[PDB]
Design a protein around this ligand. Structure first.
Ligand SMILES: CCCCCCCCCCCCCCCCCC(=O)OC[C@H](COP(=O)([O-])OCC(O)COP(=O)([O-])OC[C@@H](COC(=O)CCCCCCCCCCCCCCCCC)OC(=O)CCCCCCCCCCCCCCCCC)OC(=O)CCCCCCCCCCCCCCCCC
Ligand SMILES: CCCCCCCCCCCCCCCCCC(=O)OC[C@H](COP(=O)([O-])OCC(O)COP(=O)([O-])OC[C@@H](COC(=O)CCCCCCCCCCCCCCCCC)OC(=O)CCCCCCCCCCCCCCCCC)OC(=O)CCCCCCCCCCCCCCCCC
Ligand SMILES: CCCCCCCCCCCCCCCCCC(=O)OC[C@H](COP(=O)([O-])OCC(O)COP(=O)([O-])OC[C@@H](COC(=O)CCCCCCCCCCCCCCCCC)OC(=O)CCCCCCCCCCCCCCCCC)OC(=O)CCCCCCCCCCCCCCCCC
Ligand SMILES: CCCCCCCCCCCCCCCCCC(=O)OC[C@H](COP(=O)([O-])OCC(O)COP(=O)([O-])OC[C@@H](COC(=O)CCCCCCCCCCCCCCCCC)OC(=O)CCCCCCCCCCCCCCCCC)OC(=O)CCCCCCCCCCCCCCCCC
Ligand SMILES: CCCCCCCCCCCCCCCCCC(=O)OC[C@H](COP(=O)([O-])OCC[N+](C)(C)C)OC(=O)CCCCCCCCCCCCCCCCC
Ligand code: HEM
Ligand code: HEM
Ligand code: HEM
Ligand code: HEM
Lengths: 51, 88, 364, 70, 85, 50, 364
């Protein structure tokens, strides 16, 4: 994808990440409903109506 | 798709038989001109099970001692495979 | 067991006197903490009493309240000077290899800039008010949620007493978080030890006990730098400041030139040299984020040595930063200095701290 | 019935975080926030209606209208 | 100190040391003036040479900036003296 | 004959049916001081990303 | 490595719901910190406009400043309730054996008492002013420096705005030291683990992973405690307070009865039951010092088990403390209760926490 051999290769230093498992991750488009609903739900103001 | 080859149910106490198998089916739509459907009931076969059923019909209707065949659950039915002609 | 006290930590023998700048910064942090705690015990944050309670109560009702205030001011200025020398030495000796120490240091630097700004805001003078106004005008350029954001920051359409009170709470709170970050800084350093003049891997026979030799050297250098510091406290008390902050704030009048403190001037330059406000905000955020070392994370990266070309370029970076500060102050009247201001800012933005080994590779 | 329904429900909703998170948000909104909170609000507003602030304001306007035309 | 990253590094990299003899004198037997003037002279000369080396690019760029500064300053003086602002 | 008719998708379905988010049975003999307990093992049969 | 997270720390299975009191105390510490930081961002410390800005600006101009203030008050009350239950549990299960945990806990208790007092002072009402006056009068009894020290503390002969400003700064500062001491408390506990219902020496096959089981138990117990806590924030908002503190302070007028907060009453009792002021101060200091476990230092000591007799005497201690508080406040109108107050104080002062094996020995 980069068209370069610009990464140092080390024995076993492969498929390292934070959240998921390499090669066992969903299509990133499956999280769009989650993000949309979360943004719409969270972004709301609330007032007690004290005069 | 890969399911079981067609078989023959046989009920012992009643002594009554009958072929059976898995029929795939899909929602009806336009067909294809350049395609004659393959063998779908007996996948990856030259369709000999029809010949085996025809040959074995006389054997089965005449009365077969199928005590050496597996049963189906707790019922009185046993399964006879149609891979090869049945003579017994 | 005094022996067990001596040998609890050992360092290299190549710690030249330039390696006491951390101790000097610690001294000035202590001075700021104590002076600020004494000042806060006599401080009221409001638009009707703040300026008065500094110049009429703190500096004239106590025996040496003036001395305490001058300590606070000049200690902030000297803390920034010493921190800049500390950073310059760290860049000179390729101390970015101490990854934990460097990241914690950058966090501390950003925190200290914030502390200094919020503290300068507490003297409700002309410069304080109008610096707040200008920085918040920078804030309101955020797309979509800028204006509302500004209101939440100010609690209103103008700077007022509630604004001063929240600024006071922030100014009080932050230095203690800075203390915790200093503790983490030192913990990481003691985990990885000090570079010295040159980097060597030493066994215990080549190292020396930290206590008491380096503590005594720290005392010596600290006394010298305290002499230099107190020369300013008693004889140049107002040299690191702008006289317009002795004029009580007038929201109806803007000063002729709004100029921040000398230690924030470079950032101010980054805003004057970028015409688009949104682009300036983005570039400031990228500048601060790029000072860190948080990327790459899971790609193999290691650090090589540093050379004479890199040291000369570091000196050039210092020159460019100083020129940018002076010019960004000078551009208000003379418009022909935009050329040199932009040139210096572009030169600053194109300085290499880490020599990318990825500079050299082959294509598929 | 419970076995098949449980299998269907798990395999459909609870198996994947991509569905469980929106299900939890739906629960938060259409059950906790707009079903318990708003419910208690409406109930309180309805129980104490005769002495409501709005009722007092309306009666005041009416009485003022009456007093003015006299 | 034994559970520190630099100790771990020295254990991984360096061998088990052998054949090293160190001699130390107590400071009460060492004169503080002993090697003072020679070191002052040597270090002064070293720093003079090194700063002459690494300071040259900064000097050149500062000269160019000084030229630009003079030009702009006198341009703005001329602008102000002629009411051209 | 039945071994060359297996599909990779069928194998994946079988693997997912019986491994993912299922209760395992563990047997340990030896220094159980270092072998993780069941609860932890039950929490690693699924991933947050999925 | 999620598995490594589960096994990072393991404890005993005998953690009854009574072992969530520390978690509840931490919850109320968090609530106090947040609500206090919000209050302090709207607060001006001065006798002229302190009582006014609490009752007229914070409560009536903000949207829910009243709710913030009620949260803060009832959070202090419930923090003390939970800490008292926490101490009672630790005495019940013979947790004095966790020497470091116990000593840090006692230091934290003293700090929190100071925080509560200095906080109550900030509401410049009648009760606050006169509680300060009484305490500082108790300061005046020290030999050879009571008046010099009192003047230094108050900044004059009378409580004034400078005194309020000192108190405000101390109230702001102390809770952060408290957070540091809470961190040390938990660090020590993790070092020596928990006791549970009974004490056993368990290998790793008898211990359970702390996370997430005990985190979920903590969430459950905290939810119930927060229900109970909010039943007071919203329906009994001034149950723990005194109405005289809703009166702006008059230095010329003394209240009919000067009673501190319900969590300081025991200490007040010690003052009232000792006619001599110096002796009262000495007894107070000795009481606070004897709660700790700092002696013997180098003599060999170890802790044995606890029994039904000790638990019964612990119940008696609780009874005596409560009765002493009530009587200490009653004695202002009814002189005959002095007998019962003194009896309860005497019973309290002679309560055995640590059964000393030195009770039995021989003579040379
Ligand atoms: C502003 C301040 C700026 C810094 C000034 C201080 C400074 O430069 O200190 C470095 C400077 C370096 O020490 P030095 O000049 O080489 O030696 C001076 C003494 O001989 C050092 O004597 P010392 O290190 O023996 O300390 C004396 C004494 C600590 O002092 C006392 O105990 C004196 C008070 C006794 C009564 C109350 C208890 O030590 C102990 O109590 C512990 C000894 C037994 C250990 C357990 C076996 O002084 C110290 O480090 C003082 C000691 C610090 C505490 C650790 C010991
Ligand atoms: C003759 C006898 C002389 C005395 C004997 C002697 O030197 O004994 C050595 C003895 C100690 O030597 P050492 O054991 O090597 O330890 C010295 C250092 O620890 C270690 O020294 P180092 O060799 O590692 O070098 C320090 C290093 C590491 O950095 C540091 O140590 C920190 C200081 C770096 C420089 C300053 C950075 C400041 C950044 C923040 C500024 C903020 C300003 C805010 C202003 C606000 C205003 C409102 O930084 C540099 O070397 C870079 C600075 C280069 C300065 C010279 C540049 C010349 C070219 C100028 C071009 C034109 C410019 C425009 C016009 O005493 C001295 O070094 C005393 C100072 C001598 C300086 C002059 C030397 C001869 C020339
Ligand atoms: C809210 C209250 C929920 C509980 C209501 C009472 C259920 C009574 C029948 C089950 C029972 O007694 O379980 C004891 C149950 C827990 O015992 P367990 O042995 O762990 O339950 C699992 C069963 O053994 C094994 O489960 P099973 O044989 O009960 O069958 C499972 C079935 C059982 O579900 C039902 O019976 C509820 C009706 C389903 C239609 O649940 C489901 O299939 C999940 C239905 C989820 C519906 C969500 C609808 C909204 C989103 C769309 O304890 C209680 O009912 C006490 C209160 C718990 C409150 C939380
Ligand atoms: C060590 C790393 C463990 C790990 O993989 O954590 C991934 C961590 C939790 O995922 P998990 O370990 O699969 O836990 C899911 C269980 O169902 C969680 O259910 P649970 O039953 O285990 O409940 C405990 C759970 C949630 O429950 C609680 O924390 C207790 C209730 C709230 C207490 C405070 C009020 O605790 C956490 O989520 C702790 C989060 C802090 C890192 C661990 O992932 C995330 O937090 C989100 C990742 C995606 C967004 C990026 C976030 C980082 C930037
Ligand atoms: C976004 C990620 C949130 C955390 C994800 C997580 O832990 O999921 C598992 C947790 C717990 O799941 P669980 O433990 O029931 O099951 C996980 C494993 N499965 C599903 C296979 C059985 O899910 C939740 O807690 C659901 C709500 C998470 C919070 C979502 C907030 C979104 C807000 C967006 C705007 C801000
Ligand atoms: C908890 C610690 C601190 C407290 C309580 C504190 C408190 C205060 C107070 C009350 C003022 C206003 C009084 C005055 O202006 O003279 C002030 C001003 C100031 N503080 Fe701090 N401060 C603290 C730490 C720091 C630190 C670490 C710095 C950064 C070096 C700092 C920088 C400043 C500056 C620049 C001013 C304004 C200078 C001026 O008056 O011109 N303070 N501080
Ligand atoms: C409050 C400000 C700071 C204080 C008090 C402080 C304190 C210290 C101290 C005591 C040391 C060890 C002694 C020494 O080597 O000088 C140190 C080392 C170091 N600091 Fe800081 N520091 C501060 C800011 C920074 C900043 C902003 C950075 C930049 C990232 C930084 C980076 C480093 C590095 C890299 C080292 C180790 C240098 C080496 O030995 O190779 N520090 N600091
Ligand atoms: C840094 C954290 C804290 C800050 C900034 C803070 C600040 C304040 C301020 C400004 C007040 C006066 C406003 C008012 O009285 O409503 C106050 C009152 C008070 N605070 Fe805090 N506080 C903090 C933490 C705590 C803690 C941990 C406690 C312990 C229980 C505490 C106990 C009190 C009490 C008892 C009062 C007076 C109660 C009353 O208003 O009647 N505060 N605090
Ligand atoms: C700010 C107030 C306090 C907080 C937040 C706090 C928090 C905690 C926590 C989280 C634990 C471990 C969990 C538990 O066993 O409940 C704990 C244990 C303990 N605390 Fe505290 N604590 C506080 C005050 C005290 C005080 C005043 C003492 C009295 C000395 C004390 C003595 C102990 C003891 C002895 C244990 C261990 C009990 C055992 O496992 O046997 N704590 N505390």
């Amino acid at each position: 994808i980069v068209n370069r051999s610009t990464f140092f290769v080390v024995k076993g230093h492969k498929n390292k990440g934070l959240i998921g498992i390499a090669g066992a991750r969903h299509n990133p488009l499956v999280w769009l409903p989650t993000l949309a609903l979360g943004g719409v739900w969270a972004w709301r103001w609330a007032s007690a109506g004290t005069i | 798709m890969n399911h079981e080859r067609p078989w023959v149910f046989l009920n012992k106490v009643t002594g009554k038989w009958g072929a059976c198998g898995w029929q795939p089916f899909w929602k009806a739509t336009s067909q294809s001109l350049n395609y004659i459907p393959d063998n779908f009931i007996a996948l990856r076969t030259n369709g000999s099970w029809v010949r085996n059923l025809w040959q074995s019909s006389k054997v089965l209707d005449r009365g077969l001692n199928a005590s050496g065949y597996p049963t189906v659950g707790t019922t009185d039915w046993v399964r006879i495979p149609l891979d090869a002609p049945l003579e017994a | 067991n005094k022996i067990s006290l001596y040998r609890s930590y050992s360092t290299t023998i190549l710690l030249s006197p330039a390696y006491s700048l951390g101790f000097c910064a610690s001294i000035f942090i202590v001075i700021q903490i104590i002076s600020g705690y004494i000042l806060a015990s006599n401080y009221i944050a409001s638009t009707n009493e703040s300026f008065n309670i500094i110049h009429n109560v703190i500096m004239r009702e106590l025996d040496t309240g003036w001395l305490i205030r001058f300590n606070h001011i000049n200690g902030c200025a000297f803390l920034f000077i010493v921190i800049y020398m500390h950073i310059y030495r760290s860049l000179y000796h390729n101390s970015i290899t101490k990854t934990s120490v460097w990241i914690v240091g950058i966090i501390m630097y950003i925190l200290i800039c914030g502390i200094a700004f919020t503290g300068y805001s507490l003297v409700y003078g002309q410069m304080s008010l109008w610096a707040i106004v200008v920085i918040c005008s920078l804030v309101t350029a955020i797309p979509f949620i800028g204006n509302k954001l500004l209101i939440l920051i100010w609690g209103g359409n103008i700077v007022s007493s509630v604004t001063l009170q929240r600024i006071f709470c922030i100014h009080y709170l932050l230095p203690l978080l800075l203390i915790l970050f200093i503790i983490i800084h030192l913990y990481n350093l003691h985990n990885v030890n000090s570079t010295g003049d040159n980097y060597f891997i030493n066994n215990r026979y080549d190292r020396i006990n930290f206590y008491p030799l380096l503590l005594i050297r720290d005392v010596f250098i600290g006394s010298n730098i305290l002499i230099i510091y107190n020369i300013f406290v008693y004889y140049y008390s107002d040299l690191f400041g702008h006289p317009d902050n002795y004029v009580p704030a007038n929201p109806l009048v803007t000063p002729s030139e709004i100029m921040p403190e000398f230690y924030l001037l470079p950032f101010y330059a980054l805003i004057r040299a970028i015409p688009h406000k949104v682009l300036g905000i983005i570039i400031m955020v990228l500048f601060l984020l790029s000072l860190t070392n948080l990327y790459p994370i899971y790609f193999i990266r290691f650090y090589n040595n540093i050379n004479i070309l890199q040291r000369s370029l570091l000196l050039l970076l210092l020159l460019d930063l100083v020129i940018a500060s002076k010019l960004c102050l000078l551009i208000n009247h003379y418009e022909s200095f935009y050329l040199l201001l932009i040139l210096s800012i572009l030169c600053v933005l194109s300085h290499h701290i880490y020599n990318t080994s990825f500079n050299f590779s082959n294509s598929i | 019935m419970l076995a098949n329904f449980s299998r269907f429900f798990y395999k459909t909703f609870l198996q994947s975080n991509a569905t469980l998170i929106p299900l939890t948000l739906v629960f938060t909104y259409x059950x906790x926030x707009x079903x318990x909170x708003x419910x208690x609000x409406x109930x309180x507003x309805x129980x104490x209606x005769x002495x409501x602030x709005x009722x007092x304001x309306x009666x005041x306007x009416x009485x003022x209208x009456x007093x003015x035309x006299x | 100190e034994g559970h520190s990253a630099y100790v771990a590094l020295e254990q991984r990299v360096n061998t088990r040391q052998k054949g090293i003899i160190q001699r130390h004198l107590s400071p009460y037997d060492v004169d503080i003036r002993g090697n003072g003037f020679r070191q002052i002279y040597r270090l002064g000369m070293q720093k003079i040479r090194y700063f002459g080396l690494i300071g040259t690019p900064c000097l050149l760029v500062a000269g160019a900036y000084r030229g630009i500064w003079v030009f702009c300053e006198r341009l703005e003086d001329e602008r102000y003296w002629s009411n051209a602002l | 004959e039945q071994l060359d008719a297996i599909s990779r998708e069928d194998l994946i379905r079988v693997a997912h049916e019986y491994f993912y988010d299922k209760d395992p049975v563990v047997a340990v003999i030896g220094d159980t001081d270092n072998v993780p307990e069941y609860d932890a093992l039950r929490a690693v049969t699924y991933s947050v990303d999925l």
